[PDB]
């Protein structure tokens, strides 16, 4: 019924405070109101930017200019990656820390990179595993090094990518 995240712009900030004019003594004088409005409306701008200072620092929306700072703390350097996929690698490596490389587990990680039906996985008798891609939205060669990391120590892997079925 209520949002748990209380960090939001204050609703109707301006009309508040004006509500503290005692008994409409000054209201309708058009000389005191403008002086008060001009000062209060400055806080509006500062109040608004208080959110982006917290909202924009999250990894989901962080821009490349500062996303590097988030990656730097985790040891994931930009190298030659671009912004749209640099976000992906950060998620992939971080998610690897609570993984076991099971068949059900592997499907889950690939799920975040290719939608619901964009990926499928065949399995083979002698350590063979196969990955199929149908709806890639980013160039895969640069993402490939991580795709190896979350697999068992002895996996034998093939990678094939195509658009659609």
């Amino acid at each position: 019924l209520k949002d748990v995240n209380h960090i939001h712009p204050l609703p109707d900030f301006v009309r508040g405070g004006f509500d503290y004019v005692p008994s409409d003594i000054f209201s309708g004088k058009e000389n005191f109101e403008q002086t008060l409005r001009i000062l209060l409306e400055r806080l509006e701008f500062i109040d608004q930017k208080m959110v982006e200072l917290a909202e924009l620092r999250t990894t989901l929306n962080a821009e490349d200019a500062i996303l590097d700072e988030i990656g730097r703390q985790l040891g994931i350097y930009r190298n030659g990656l671009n912004d749209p996929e640099y976000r992906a690698v950060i998620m992939i490596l971080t998610g690897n820390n609570s993984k076991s490389g099971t068949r059900a587990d592997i499907i889950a990680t690939l799920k975040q990179l290719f939608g619901e039906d964009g990926v499928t996985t065949y399995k083979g008798y002698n350590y063979r595993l196969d990955i199929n891609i149908f709806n890639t939205c980013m160039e895969v060669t640069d993402i490939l090094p991580e795709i190896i990391d979350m697999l068992p120590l002895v996996t034998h892997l093939r990678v094939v990518e195509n658009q659609g079925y």
Partner: protein
Amino acid sequence: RTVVRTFDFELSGYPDETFRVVLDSVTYELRFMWNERDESWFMSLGDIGAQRPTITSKLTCYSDILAPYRYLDNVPDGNLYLWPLGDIRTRAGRFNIGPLKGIQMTYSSLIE
């Protein structure tokens, strides 16, 4: 790290409570401030008569408050937690802190 429960807290809901407590035979002074917009309790910890508090943090349920601060000679080495007595989904409030109000703020000390 064996630990034993040894102290419990209660709050009357006044927005600027301040009182002195004794833990592990040492004495500390605590300050609690209520935040309106964030509807949460702010806790400050320090020595008796200290100019400034040693530690300030925001209270939350099932979070180890003292975790990153067990490296100072004036900080308790025990465990401080807030967990609910009722439904597990209830979050810390203003008047719902106490041994029977819904949230059990507790301190426990390691066995040495």
